Amino acid sequence: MIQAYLGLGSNIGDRESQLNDAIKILNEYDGISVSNISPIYETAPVGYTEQPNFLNLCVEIQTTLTVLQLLECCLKTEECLHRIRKERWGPRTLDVDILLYGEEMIDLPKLSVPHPRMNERAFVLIPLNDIAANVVEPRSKLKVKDLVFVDDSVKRY
Ligand SMILES: Nc1ncnc2c1ncn2[C@@H]1O[C@H](COP(=O)(O)CP(=O)(O)OP(=O)(O)O)[C@@H](O)[C@H]1O
Ligand SMILES: Nc1nc2nc(SCc3ccc(F)cc3)[nH]c2c(=O)[nH]1
Ligand SMILES: [Cl-]
Ligand SMILES: [Mg+2]
Ligand SMILES: [Mg+2]
Ligand code: NA
Ligand code: NA
């Protein structure tokens, strides 16, 4: 059994209902057991143009899946939630990102763990710190509580 952390996001549709449904679906896969869920935060979009605000959270799982098996479950969950994939990025019903998989470092064309952008994302680190403050991010070798930073664009929902 591996302790892993997922980052979830939604910025279109009924954001909160979609996040809750996603967690339930994730938990229903054999080999994934949801053990903790952060508070939900409303967050300003980063890395693109002006877009509707996100609801973001983090989830702790105990898994017996390999990290690629896990990734398949994450992407299937997005499909259950009807996520649209057009030529250009836009708002999405659900995004399920693998943040951390134990202390492992994976670099494959289809999978990068720890997530390559997490250490500079408040919408990740603030909810992650609520459930994983003492977990080590293996690239930096820092605990989450030593990466997190204050960011007024991330608010409790
Ligand atoms: N840690 C990770 N978690 C989830 N998908 C990952 C991943 N590392 C790589 N991927 C790949 O990323 C592909 C595109 O996923 P998307 O969800 O569209 C990116 P995004 O989550 O919108 O952007 P972001 O990575 O900047 O958060 C997936 O099909 C998967 O193969
Ligand atoms: N707050 C926040 N910003 C995030 N930026 C990304 S990737 C660029 C992007 C893609 C589509 C979109 F509509 C807005 C921004 N994912 C995010 C997330 O989950 N939360
Ligand atoms: Cl969508
Ligand atoms: Mg994603
Ligand atoms: Mg993402
Ligand atoms: Na399960
Ligand atoms: Na790579």
Measure the CA angle with vertex 137, ends 116 and 30; round to 5°: 85
* Separation of alpha carbons 76 and 79, rounded Å: 5
Q: Which of 66, 71, 93, 121 to mutate to test the pocket of ligand 1 (most atoms within 8 A of CB)?
A: 71
Number of domains in the chain: 1
Domain boundaries, position 94:
1-157
- 88: domain CATH number is 3.30.70.560
Active site residue 15: no
| Resolution limit, Å | 1.3
* Separation of alpha carbons 59 and 36, rounded Å: 6
* Separation of alpha carbons 42 and 154, rounded Å: 6
Is 135 in a helix, a strand, or coil?
A: coil
| Strand 154-156 with 41-43, pairing | antiparallel
Tokens of 145: 């509580």
